[PDB]
Enzyme design. Structure first.
Site, PDB file in Angstrom:
ATOM      1  N   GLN A  76       0.827  -1.205   0.000  1.00 21.68           N
ATOM      2  CA  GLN A  76       0.000   0.000   0.000  1.00 21.68           C
ATOM      3  C   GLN A  76       0.860   1.254   0.000  1.00 21.68           C
ATOM      4  OE1 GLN A  76      -2.919   0.681   3.391  1.00 21.68           O
ATOM      5  NE2 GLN A  76      -1.324   2.177   3.893  1.00 21.68           N
ATOM      6  N   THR A 130       3.570   0.929  13.771  1.00 22.97           N
ATOM      7  CA  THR A 130       2.176   0.824  13.317  1.00 22.97           C
ATOM      8  C   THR A 130       1.751  -0.612  13.008  1.00 22.97           C
ATOM      9  OG1 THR A 130       2.640   1.334  10.965  1.00 22.97           O
ATOM     10  CG2 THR A 130       2.223   3.138  12.425  1.00 22.97           C
ATOM     11  N   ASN A 157      10.337   5.764   8.281  1.00 28.47           N
ATOM     12  CA  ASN A 157       9.399   6.874   8.377  1.00 28.47           C
ATOM     13  C   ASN A 157       9.853   7.932   9.375  1.00 28.47           C
ATOM     14  OD1 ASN A 157       7.317   4.149   8.106  1.00 28.47           O
ATOM     15  ND2 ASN A 157       7.351   5.718   6.504  1.00 28.47           N
ATOM     16  N   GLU A 200      26.194   2.888 -13.431  1.00 26.20           N
ATOM     17  CA  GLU A 200      27.281   3.513 -12.696  1.00 26.20           C
ATOM     18  C   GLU A 200      26.947   3.801 -11.234  1.00 26.20           C
ATOM     19  OE1 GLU A 200      30.442   4.256 -13.504  1.00 26.20           O
ATOM     20  OE2 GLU A 200      30.366   3.474 -15.554  1.00 26.20           O
ATOM     21  N   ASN A 253       5.881  11.249   1.346  1.00 27.21           N
ATOM     22  CA  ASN A 253       6.064  10.856  -0.040  1.00 27.21           C
ATOM     23  C   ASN A 253       6.593  12.016  -0.871  1.00 27.21           C
ATOM     24  OD1 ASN A 253       5.099   8.431   0.803  1.00 27.21           O
ATOM     25  ND2 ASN A 253       3.130   8.574  -0.254  1.00 27.21           N
ATOM     26  N   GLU A 273      -4.951  -5.755  -1.835  1.00 23.46           N
ATOM     27  CA  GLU A 273      -6.109  -5.043  -1.329  1.00 23.46           C
ATOM     28  C   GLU A 273      -6.525  -3.947  -2.299  1.00 23.46           C
ATOM     29  OE1 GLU A 273      -8.701  -4.079   2.306  1.00 23.46           O
ATOM     30  OE2 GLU A 273      -8.037  -5.819   1.153  1.00 23.46           O
ATOM     31  N   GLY A 324       2.208  -6.981   4.671  1.00 20.12           N
ATOM     32  CA  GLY A 324       1.695  -8.138   3.972  1.00 20.12           C
ATOM     33  C   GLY A 324       2.221  -8.242   2.560  1.00 20.12           C
ATOM     34  N   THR A 325       1.445  -7.752   1.593  1.00 21.29           N
ATOM     35  CA  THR A 325       1.813  -7.845   0.184  1.00 21.29           C
ATOM     36  C   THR A 325       3.110  -7.113  -0.154  1.00 21.29           C
ATOM     37  OG1 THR A 325       0.990  -7.463  -2.059  1.00 21.29           O
ATOM     38  CG2 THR A 325       0.402  -5.869  -0.372  1.00 21.29           C
TER      39      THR A 325
HETATM   40  N1  GTP Z   1       6.495   6.184   3.166  1.00 18.83           N
HETATM   41  C1  GTP Z   1       5.261   5.735   3.367  1.00 18.83           C
HETATM   42  N2  GTP Z   1       5.049   4.662   4.200  1.00 18.83           N
HETATM   43  C2  GTP Z   1       3.796   4.203   4.410  1.00 18.83           C
HETATM   44  C3  GTP Z   1       2.713   4.796   3.791  1.00 18.83           C
HETATM   45  N3  GTP Z   1       1.602   4.134   4.179  1.00 18.83           N
HETATM   46  C4  GTP Z   1       1.960   3.139   5.022  1.00 18.83           C
HETATM   47  N4  GTP Z   1       3.317   3.176   5.169  1.00 18.83           N
HETATM   48  C5  GTP Z   1       4.149   2.288   5.985  1.00 18.83           C
HETATM   49  O1  GTP Z   1       3.941   0.941   5.633  1.00 18.83           O
HETATM   50  C6  GTP Z   1       4.234   0.140   6.752  1.00 18.83           C
HETATM   51  C7  GTP Z   1       3.414  -1.142   6.743  1.00 18.83           C
HETATM   52  O2  GTP Z   1       3.006  -1.514   5.444  1.00 18.83           O
HETATM   53  P1  GTP Z   1       1.459  -1.331   5.058  1.00 18.83           P
HETATM   54  O3  GTP Z   1       1.081   0.118   5.207  1.00 18.83           O
HETATM   55  O4  GTP Z   1       0.607  -2.192   5.953  1.00 18.83           O
HETATM   56  O5  GTP Z   1       1.292  -1.762   3.516  1.00 18.83           O
HETATM   57  P2  GTP Z   1       1.474  -3.262   2.968  1.00 18.83           P
HETATM   58  O6  GTP Z   1       2.915  -3.543   2.634  1.00 18.83           O
HETATM   59  O7  GTP Z   1       0.600  -3.434   1.758  1.00 18.83           O
HETATM   60  O8  GTP Z   1       0.922  -4.288   4.076  1.00 18.83           O
HETATM   61  P3  GTP Z   1      -0.563  -4.904   3.972  1.00 18.83           P
HETATM   62  O9  GTP Z   1      -1.548  -3.825   3.591  1.00 18.83           O
HETATM   63  O10 GTP Z   1      -0.967  -5.481   5.304  1.00 18.83           O
HETATM   64  O11 GTP Z   1      -0.566  -6.011   2.951  1.00 18.83           O
HETATM   65  C8  GTP Z   1       3.901   0.988   7.968  1.00 18.83           C
HETATM   66  O12 GTP Z   1       4.952   0.949   8.903  1.00 18.83           O
HETATM   67  C9  GTP Z   1       3.746   2.396   7.441  1.00 18.83           C
HETATM   68  O13 GTP Z   1       4.594   3.280   8.131  1.00 18.83           O
HETATM   69  C10 GTP Z   1       2.920   5.877   2.952  1.00 18.83           C
HETATM   70  O14 GTP Z   1       1.969   6.418   2.396  1.00 18.83           O
HETATM   71  N5  GTP Z   1       4.197   6.343   2.743  1.00 18.83           N
HETATM   72 MG    MG Z   2      -1.220  -4.455   1.765  1.00 27.08          MG
END
Ligand code: GTP
Ligand code: MG
Lengths: 48, 428
Positions: free
Chosen positions: B11, B170, B197, B245, B219, B62, B135-136
């Protein structure tokens, strides 16, 4: 001789009369809060 | 010629793609529909009457976070099957992403990456963006590396991680998804940029002076990292650096490929115009050991290599003067097998201004992709969480339930253990 005339009215004959029906007319009128208009105004148009 | 394919998974991958592909759109002039009112070739294409389709795959199990770009203004920009979605989220489960529900979406991801590579006349890299905390992004993202490293062998695969922060998580099963996903980013990844983060929170707090920043503001800065990274692939400059490089003059012995990012003309408009943001001051803020985008102090590590990407009205005489003053300071130290440790690259294009976001108008930029032995502590902090959880076999029934044997927990920790052992071995 006279006859003592029968005065008498049982429990089942005395102590309830038909009541007025209860006055019920009240729904739950809920004013809907309007959907709060959405600007988590997105990334592309937001900065560039 | 000169094409790069970005591969977003997780995500955080979609949201970081919403800012990065935004910046690539402005930096060549593409309107929100996809029409300019050939520097653009690395990121966009030419589809007849001025249409400009991005070279990306947005991949998620998702649908919710990929639907907001499908329902916002940019359904019309992205090709509508370049935004591959799923049904059920992997749900913070590395087992679900890598073995169970990632193995049905992996077909559409590889088919679309193949179609996005067939229209290339010389492809430089795969800029994969992900977040190893869930997750993903930990699961399917790992498996996509397994499929990419076997069909595109010679191809280099850059990877912008979002490695777990020390005190901010988180997610509580996050130490499991981080340690178990090291092997994708150790043997099937050629450049592993480690971001977190909290370091972006601190940069936003003291430099941009936004006290309360959101993920969308995080971001912002990571978008500026890739713009300076692919700066020489798109616009002319005095010294140019391509992704071949970056992975040559920076990466030592092949297992050590873990780099750290530090952009540092970060400033906003209340400060910006009061100071000279010239080459000397922006590179001292770049090497400052509190602007690292890792929460990883370089003052206990040795700089093995550094890649300064100056970007703007930067003269090469000032670059050679700036590398002199950072080399004469004792607080910055280098490994003995490094007489020269800088790959300076200048892009003539000024930094892209940010209307309505967070940065300000600056005439020149700098971004560092530096490999050091200090990065042997971002994994030691996650060792302590992994050993504490796996001592009592906590949370492991969720892993073993979809077909993830209990064995892999031990040699994923052991693989990271050999990763740590390899890092103090270089610094002797
Ligand atoms: N830099 C950045 N990090 C994010 C953002 N949204 C979530 N995260 C980070 O992503 C980490 C966890 O991953 P998820 O947000 O759950 O996304 P995911 O990899 O798809 O995991 P699942 O949704 O459970 O499958 C958290 O520690 C958040 O700090 C974002 O918009 N920007
Ligand atoms: Mg996910």
């Amino acid at each position: 001789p006279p006859t003592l005339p029968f005065h008498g009215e049982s429990a089942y004959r005395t102590d309830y009369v038909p009541k007025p029906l209860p006055e019920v007319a009240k729904p739950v009128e809920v004013k809907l809060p309007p959907t709060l208009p959405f600007n988590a105004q997105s990334c592309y148009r937001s900065e560039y | 010629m000169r094409e790069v394919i970005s591969i977003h998974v997780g995500q955080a991958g979609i949201q970081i793609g919403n800012a990065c592909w935004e910046l690539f759109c402005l930096e060549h002039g593409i309107q929100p529909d996809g029409q300019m009112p050939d520097a653009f070739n690395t990121f966009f294409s030419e589809t007849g009457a001025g249409k400009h389709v991005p070279r990306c795959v947005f991949l998620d199990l998702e649908p919710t976070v990929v639907d907001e770009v499908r329902t916002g203004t940019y359904r019309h920009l992205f090709h509508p099957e370049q935004l591959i979605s799923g049904k059920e989220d992997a749900a913070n489960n590395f087992a679900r992403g890598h073995y169970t529900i990632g193995k049905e979406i992996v077909d559409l991801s590889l088919d679309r990456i193949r179609k996005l590579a067939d229209n290339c006349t010389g492809l430089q890299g795969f800029l994969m963006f992900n977040a190893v905390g869930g997750g993903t992004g930990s699961g399917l993202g790992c498996l996509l590396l397994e499929r990419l490293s076997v069909d595109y062998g010679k191809k280099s695969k850059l990877n912008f991680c979002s490695w777990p922060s020390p005190q901010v998580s988180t997610a509580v099963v996050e130490p499991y998804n981080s340690v178990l996903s090291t092997h994708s980013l150790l043997e099937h990844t050629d450049v592993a940029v480690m971001l977190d983060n909290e370091a972006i929170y601190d940069i936003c707090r003291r430099n941009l002076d936004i006290e309360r920043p959101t993920y969308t503001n995080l971001n912002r800065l990571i978008a500026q990292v890739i713009s300076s990274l692919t700066a020489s692939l798109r616009f002319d400059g005095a010294l140019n650096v391509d992704v071949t490089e970056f992975q040559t003059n920076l990466v030592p012995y092949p297992r050590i490929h873990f780099m750290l990012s530090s952009y540092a003309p970060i400033i906003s408009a209340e400060k910006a115009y009061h100071e000279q943001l010239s080459v000397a001051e922006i590179t001292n803020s770049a090497f400052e050991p509190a602007s690292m985008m890792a929460k990883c102090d370089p003052r206990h590590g040795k700089y093995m290599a550094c890649c300064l990407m100056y970007r703007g009205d930067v003269v090469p005489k000032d670059v050679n003067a700036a590398v002199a003053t950072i080399k004469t300071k004792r607080t910055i130290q280098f490994v003995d097998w490094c007489p020269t440790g800088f790959k300076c690259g200048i892009n003539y294009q000024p930094p892209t201004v940010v209307p309505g976001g967070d940065l300000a108008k600056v005439m020149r930029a700098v971004c560092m992709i530096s490999n050091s032995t200090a990065i042997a502590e971002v994994f030691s902090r996650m060792d302590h969480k992994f050993d504490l959880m796996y001592a009592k076999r906590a949370f492991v029934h969720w892993y073993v339930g979809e077909g993830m044997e209990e064995g892999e927990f031990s040699e994923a920790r052991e693989d990271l253990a050999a990763l740590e052992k390899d890092y103090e071995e270089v610094g002797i």
